[PDB]
Write a protein that binds this DNA or RNA. Sequence first.
RNA 1: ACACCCAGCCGC
Lengths: 261, 50, 48
Amino acid sequence: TCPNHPDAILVEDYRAGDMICPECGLVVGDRVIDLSTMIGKGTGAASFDEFGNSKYQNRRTMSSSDRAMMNAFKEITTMADRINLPRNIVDRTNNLFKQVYEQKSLKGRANDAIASACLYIACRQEGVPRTFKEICAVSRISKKEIGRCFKLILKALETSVDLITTGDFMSRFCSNLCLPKQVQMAATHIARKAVELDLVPGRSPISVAAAAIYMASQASAEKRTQKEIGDIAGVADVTIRQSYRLIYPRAPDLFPTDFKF
Amino acid sequence: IVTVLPVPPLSVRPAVVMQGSARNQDDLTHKLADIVKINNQLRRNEQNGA
Amino acid sequence: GFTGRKITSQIFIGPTYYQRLKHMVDDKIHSRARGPIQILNRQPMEGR
RNA sequence: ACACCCAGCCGC
Ligand SMILES: [Zn+2]
């Protein structure tokens, strides 16, 4: 906006305090620059009525939709703190919840269902997915409702999510089972080889992941029982035996180069 | 006795920065929003008839 | 040290422990010439 | 890139 120089950008000098031209040094503009309330408790007793009650208190109207969003965010925070999620996933969950709530398509379902569905979406989109059963453990909602709500969120908000692979769950399962790094690497190699070689058509990745856990567990000094595997994975012991008896042939090929048998 | 409340201009109660997209307002702006809300509520409730 | 002459007052000299404090002068020197101003009143801002 | 609040510290 420099005179005598049409179409000239002005360098803003936050130290010298001016707006300055890189052809002639003129200055345009002499200097540079740079909803509610709460009513608390009364201090003096002069505000109290004959029955007390202080006569002056916060009405806290703040619309209905803002109240719904605030309760939903409280539910998201107290849900994600239980499995100890980092706050980036919480903020992404809040972003998805606000987009869904302003999309105005899922009024017919409990806000808590949309909340846990957005938690699942945000856990998926960071490359650290949780299982549906892990979300169901820290939520008051059945697996059917969260599945249907997840199906409606992906249909409505028009986004694509990456398909889960077995290797994402391996670190959480081994670490929560307190297994060392060699067990981690061996189990991940077993899971990825079993996926790629095609022993398991249409099997869920959670079952073969826990099967790889059982592989790496029943080959070293430390050993884990079927019940512990089902406790940490959520898959039933029958499903572990199904995956065991179907993965057991061609065992040395699935193992890595060295494991110290 | 006041019957009209003079709202101060944006120079008296300007908006401050933070990271940027906040554009936080002065405390006078927030209280005046509250004043306008309560005054509008009273003005409608005068003929709504509580 | 300048003229090489003896000082006719025998100076008390010796080792003594000294400490360098946090307050260096390059962290305190400060000057202004029509710099930035505040929003609320258009006075100069506070502090180095 | 702020604005309050708090703390610590400097000279007299
Ligand atoms: Zn110019």
